[PDB]
Design a binder for this molecule. Structure first.
Ligand SMILES: CC(C)[C@@H](NC(=O)[C@H](CCS)NC(=O)CCC[C@H](N)C(=O)O)C(=O)O
Ligand SMILES: [Fe+3]
Length: 325
C-alpha cells in the first residue's frame, strides 16, 4: 500500500512580524518543502478555522435546491451567462457527488473598472438571500480578507525563499484587483454511493478528482480531518496526512513557470472517501495584468528561457484547460 508523504508543519507566524532573521528561517523551510514533495502545513496562521468550518457547514446544510438553481453558474443554468466562475456548482445525484460555491474578490462590484469593461475572469459575486442565510455573506467576505492576509504573509516567505525581497510576489497581490477565489466544497456521505460518481486511477485507486496541477500562484487550503489527498513523487503517489488545524499549502503552475520549475506545481489527486466533509481552497491569483519576469534560482545569472506571461492570460487559459482535462 501507500507511503505517507513528507508534509512538514511550518510555523509561519514570523512572516507577520518584523524579525527578519526569523523570517529567513521560515523561508528556508518553505524552500525545502517546495523542493521536496511540494506541500507543507502552515501552522500558527492566526485564522479561526473552526468557526470557518461551522459557518460553511451551516450554509451547505441549509441551502435548498431552489436556491442552488438561482445561484448556479452557466454550466448549470443557461440564464446566467455572466456566471462563469462565481456561484453554485450543483451535484448531479447518481452521477456527480460533489457540489460547491465559489466567490471572488468582494471588491468586484458593479462599478469596478474591470467589471465595467467585462474583462474575462472578473465577475460580481452572487449570494443567497440574507434572511435565509443570516450573516453568511458578511462572514464569507471577511473570510476572504482573513485568508488574503495569510496568503500575503506566505508570499513574503516564498519571495525570501527564492532570494528576492519580501514584496516580490505580494506587490502584485492587491485587494483592489486580485483574481483570487474561495471555493466552499461539500463532499457528501452517500449510501449507496453511485459508482458513476467515482473515478478510477490507472493504479486502481478510487478517486473523486483526477490528477492535476493547480491553476494558481499558490493554493491555501483548509480541509476536514479526513485523509484524502495524494501527491505524486518519484516514489509514486503518497498520502498527505490530514490536519484540520493547519492550512495545506502548495504551488500552482504559475509559480512553476516563474521559477523555471525550481518550485514545481505538484501533481495531486483526491481519493474517493465516503464521508461528509469540507474542502475550502483559496486559490492565490494575482491581477489581470500582473507579469513577473521568469527567472531560475539554480542558474548563476538567474536567467530563464521562458517568456513572460500575464496572470490574466495564464488564468483564462488554465481554468478552461482544467475543465477540459
Ligand atoms: C485539488 C482539486 C481536485 C480541487 N481543487 C482544485 O485544485 C480544482 C482544480 C479543478 S476543479 N478546483 C478548481 O480549479 C475549480 C475552482 C476554480 C474556481 N472555480 C476559480 O475559477 O477560481 C477540486 O476542485 O476538487
Ligand atoms: Fe488541486
Amino acid at each position: 500500500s501507500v507511503s505517507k508523504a513528507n508534509v512538514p508543519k511550518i510555523d509561519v507566524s514570523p512572516l507577520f512580524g518584523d524579525d527578519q532573521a526569523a523570517k529567513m528561517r521560515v523561508a528556508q523551510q518553505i524552500d525545502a518543502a517546495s523542493r521536496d514533495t511540494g506541500f507543507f502545513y502552515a501552522v500558527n496562521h492566526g485564522i479561526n478555522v473552526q468557526r470557518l468550518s461551522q459557518k460553511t457547514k451551516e450554509f451547505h446544510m441549509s441551502i435548498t435546491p431552489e436556491e442552488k438553481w438561482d445561484l448556479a453558474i452557466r454550466a448549470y443554468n443557461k440564464e446566467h451567462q455572466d456566471q462563469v466562475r462565481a456561484g453554485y456548482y450543483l451535484s448531479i445525484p447518481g452521477k456527480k457527488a460533489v457540489e460547491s460555491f465559489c466567490y471572488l474578490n468582494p471588491n468586484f462590484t458593479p462599478d469596478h473598472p474591470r467589471i465595467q469593461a467585462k474583462t474575462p475572469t472578473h465577475e460580481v459575486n452572487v449570494w443567497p438571500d440574507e434572511t435565509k442565510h443570516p450573516g453568511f455573506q458578511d462572514f464569507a467576505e471577511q473570510y476572504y480578507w482573513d485568508v488574503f492576509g495569510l496568503s500575503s504573509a506566505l508570499l513574503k516567505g516564498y519571495a525570501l525563499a527564492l532570494g528576492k525581497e519580501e514584496n516580490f510576489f505580494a506587490r502584485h497581490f492587491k485587494p483592489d484587483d486580485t483574481l483570487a477565489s474561495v471555493v466552499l466544497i461539500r463532499y457528501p456521505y452517500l449510501d449507496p454511493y453511485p459508482e458513476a460518481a467515482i473515478k478510477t486511477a490507472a493504479d486502481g485507486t478510487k478517486l473523486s478528482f483526477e490528477w492535476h496541477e493547480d491553476v494558481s500562484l499558490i493554493t491555501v487550503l483548509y480541509q476536514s480531518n479526513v485523509q484524502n489527498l495524494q501527491v505524486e513523487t518519484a516514489a509514486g503517489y503518497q498520502d498527505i496526512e490530514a490536519d484540520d488545524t493547519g492550512y495545506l499549502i502548495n504551488c500552482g503552475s504559475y509559480m512553476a513557470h516563474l521559477t523555471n520549475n525550481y518550485y514545481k506545481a505538484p501533481i495531486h489527486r483526491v481519493k474517493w472517501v465516503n464521508a461528509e466533509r469540507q474542502s475550502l481552497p483559496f486559490f492565490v491569483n494575482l491581477g489581470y495584468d500582473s507579469v513577473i519576469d521568469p527567472f531560475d534560482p539554480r542558474e548563476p545569472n538567474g536567467k530563464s528561457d521562458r517568456e513572460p506571461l500575464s496572470y490574466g492570460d495564464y488564468l483564462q487559459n488554465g481554468l478552461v484547460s482544467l475543465i477540459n482535462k
